[PDB]
Amino acid sequence: MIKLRMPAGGERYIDGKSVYKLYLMIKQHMNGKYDVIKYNWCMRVSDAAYQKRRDKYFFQKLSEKYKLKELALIFISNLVANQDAWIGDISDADALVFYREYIGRLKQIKFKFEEDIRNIYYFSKKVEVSAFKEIFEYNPKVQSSYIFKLLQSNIISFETFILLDSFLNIIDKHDEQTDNLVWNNYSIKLKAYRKILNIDSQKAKNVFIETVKSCKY
Ligand SMILES: [Cl-]
Ligand SMILES: [Cl-]
Ligand SMILES: [Cl-]
Ligand SMILES: [Cl-]
Ligand SMILES: [Cl-]
Ligand SMILES: [Cl-]
Ligand SMILES: [Cl-]
Ligand SMILES: [Cl-]
Ligand SMILES: [Cl-]
Ligand SMILES: [Ir+4]
Ligand SMILES: [Ir+4]
After folding, report:
1. Is CB count within 10 Å lower at the N or C end of the chain?
2. Cα(28) to centroid of ligand 3, in Å?
3. Candidate CATH numbers 1.10.3080.10, 1.10.10.10, 1.10.3720.10, 1.10.8.60; the one for domain 6-107
């Protein structure tokens, strides 16, 4: 149903500067300044900028131990879900600890998706929607939506939001109806992550329908 797109030759070990380049390309991608898929996980960087770094040891240590696929996951998981890495330096974000905790989450994505769907459904009853669709539609009054609010409160994950988006078109519709800064900040990350996620919309839809049905009856 869902797979993360990854740089080619993921079993490879690379050097410290290369680890730094990988981090920078993913960082820029998550900020909407680059597209790792468009450029096939390759990017040129400023050596002067790298040399100016006071934390070159961080990238060196990671390079000694982790394969390319693991390095990519460490950076992706942190830059997507670790708010401490959204603006703060990766060498200051407790990245490895965060990554270890996040890989376990990625391994159970389908179960987590189902869990999130059930929670979205029961929440919809608590707020007394007149129709389930009201949860996902942008609300001009509050410049937001219940589904976005749930993501903000960390009740559901980014993967769940993007999975729902695959067949509900939530992100693009929100983007066209508002300029809200808070949404935009999240939307930049959502669209960036969506680019590296390979999602089978039909399968995600099937899971959604089956899960809601089990909540209703
Ligand atoms: Cl599958
Ligand atoms: Cl599947
Ligand atoms: Cl599957
Ligand atoms: Cl499957
Ligand atoms: Cl399947
Ligand atoms: Cl399957
Ligand atoms: Cl109606
Ligand atoms: Cl309607
Ligand atoms: Cl309506
Ligand atoms: Ir499957
Ligand atoms: Ir209507």
Report:
1. C
2. 31
3. 1.10.8.60
